[PDB]
Amino acid sequence: ADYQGKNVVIIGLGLTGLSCVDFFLARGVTPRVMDTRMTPPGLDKLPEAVERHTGSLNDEWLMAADLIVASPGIALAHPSLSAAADAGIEIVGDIELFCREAQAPIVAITGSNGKSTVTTLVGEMAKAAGVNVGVGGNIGLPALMLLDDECELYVLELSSFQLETTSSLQAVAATILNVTEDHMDRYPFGLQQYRAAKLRIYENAKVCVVNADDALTMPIRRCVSFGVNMGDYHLNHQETWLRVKGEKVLNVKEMKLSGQHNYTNALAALALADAAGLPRASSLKALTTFTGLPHRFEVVLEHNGVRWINDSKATNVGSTEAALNGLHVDGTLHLLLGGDGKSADFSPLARYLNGDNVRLYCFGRDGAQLAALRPEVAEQTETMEQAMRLLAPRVQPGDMVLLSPACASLDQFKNFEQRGNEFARLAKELGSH
Numbered sequence: 290a291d292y293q294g295k296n297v298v299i300i301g302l303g304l305t306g307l308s309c310v311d312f313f314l315a316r317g318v319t320p321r322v323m324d325t326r327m328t329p330p331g332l333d334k335l336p337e338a339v340e341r342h343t344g345s346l347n348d349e350w351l352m353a354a355d356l357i358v359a360s361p362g363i364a365l366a367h368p369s370l371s372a373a374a375d376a377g378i379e380i381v382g383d384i385e386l387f388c389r390e391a392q393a394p395i396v397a398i399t400g401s402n403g404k405s406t407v408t409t410l411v412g413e414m415a416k417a418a419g420v421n422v423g424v425g426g427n428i429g430l431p432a433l434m435l436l437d438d439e440c441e442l443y444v445l446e447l448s449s450f451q452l453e454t455t456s457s458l459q460a461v462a463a464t465i466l467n468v469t470e471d472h473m474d475r476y477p478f479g480l481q482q483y484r485a486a487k488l489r490i491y492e493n494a495k496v497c498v499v500n501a502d503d504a505l506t507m508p509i510r511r512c513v514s515f516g517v518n519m520g521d522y523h524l525n526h527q528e529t530w531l532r533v534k535g536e537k538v539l540n541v542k543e544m545k546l547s548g549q550h551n552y553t554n555a556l557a558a559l560a561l562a563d564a565a566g567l568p569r570a571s572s573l574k575a576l577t578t579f580t581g582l583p584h585r586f587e588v589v590l591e592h593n594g595v596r597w598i599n600d601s602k603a604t605n606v607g608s609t610e611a612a613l614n615g616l617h618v619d620g621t622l623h624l625l626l627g628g629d630g631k632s633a634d635f636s637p638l639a640r641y642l643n644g645d646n647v648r649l650y651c652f653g654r655d656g657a658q659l660a661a662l663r664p665e666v667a668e669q670t671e672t673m674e675q676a677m678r679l680l681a682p683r684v685q686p687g688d689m690v691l692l693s694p695a696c697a698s699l700d701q702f703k704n705f706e707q708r709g710n711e712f713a714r715l716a717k718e719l720g721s722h
């Protein structure tokens with residue numbers, strides 16, 4: 290694509306908004322930037338020659354634009370964007386701009402849970418094969434920061450929000466790992482509308498990879514499948530093995546990751562890597578070396594008979610359910626829940642919270658709603674720190690402390706990483722004498 294002479298408006302700063310700014314400048318186009326936040330991240334990094342408008346949208350700028358580059362963090366349904374669309378003004382996001390330029394095949398991964406794990410895994414499979422790979426998108430570096438004509442493969446995590454503004458993706462391999470309720474604050478037509486956004490990832494994909502166990506991951510109108518008991522890629526319990534069409538490929542005792550949902554993450558990653566043409570041996574090797582992502586069921590302290598686990602990356606109900614389903618606790622589970630629940634129904638969690646060995650410590654915007662899952666075993670505080678200091682004295686040898694909050698952190702924190710980092714610091718303070 291050619292942007293010379295166009296009036297370009299970018300909505301949303303941050304590293305992504307900045308990567309869009311840098312993208313245009315390097316192409317001889319000075320964009321203008323707006324953000325609904327008064328002091329958006331990276332404002333101080335924004336070059337002085339770039340005009341900016343913060344604290345609201347600017348309809349004069351939007352309606353004058355030839356191209357609007359919209360952060361995934363702003364709804365296309367926002368009246369100002371709806372007005373621009375009605376006017377025939379083209380709206381894209383960073384992923385769209387990237388796809389128009391990329392000169393290597395793209396593996397594209399979305400889903401409500403497991404997408405960063407599968408993304409990072411496919412990256413490691415490529416690295417083990419000696420492929421120059423760029424890994425990022427919705428995690429790590431924004432996609433435009435990966436663009437390099439020496440890159441031989443791109444592996445992108447894409448959110449439902451990014452997908453809504455992307456039209457030119459033709460993935461070599463694409464998957465929706467699963468679809469469970471999330472982002473309902475952005476999808477007023479409910480679960481099918483959210484699903485529709487993710488289904489975009491399959492458009493013009495060379496191979497589609499679906500979850501045999503989740504019908505919502507399948508196109509409305511074959512794909513390769515992965516699953517637990519069925520699928521082209523499936524599990525065999527003997528010990529557990531990864532299998533491809535009846536052939537054993539890996540005894541999961543060689544994996545550092547554990548738990549059934551990580552075994553299906555492994556299958557999804559292998560299916561994508563196979564479709565991308567990566568050698569099978571090096572892909573299997575990566576499965577054995579990968580240790581996990583920070584904030585993803587991460588043991589931050591195991592001391593004095595107590596495991597403290599940072600699962601701050603659990604920003605939705607289905608992710609917290611993945612941590613709880615099949616969870617082994619010797620003594621009492623001390624579960625930290627809270628933040629901005631994005632209008633989620635938390636009741637699917639209730640079935641894991643029965644018995645004499647669970648306590649709930651509920652905080653942030655939706656703390657009262659979370660406490661209400663089982664009031665008799667729940668405490669509510671304003672902050673996660675308060676919750677930690679409340680629970681710490683009650684922790685006994687055999688117990689587990691688990692931050693798996695089922696909510697976005699954005700009511701009280703910059704992001705789930707800062708929430709995880711704060712938890713870890715507090716765990717280390719409170720978990721020794």
Ligand SMILES: CCCCOc1ccc2cc(S(=O)(=O)N[C@H](CCC(=O)O)C(=O)O)ccc2c1
Nearest residue numbers: 300301324325360362363604697698699704705
């Ligand atoms: C003009 C836009 C101003 C707001 O900027 C944003 C950019 C990206 C965004 C991405 C998302 S998001 O939904 O993709 N990610 C959050 C992350 C939660 C957490 O880290 O605790 C979530 O899954 O709930 C939400 C809001 C966003 C807002």
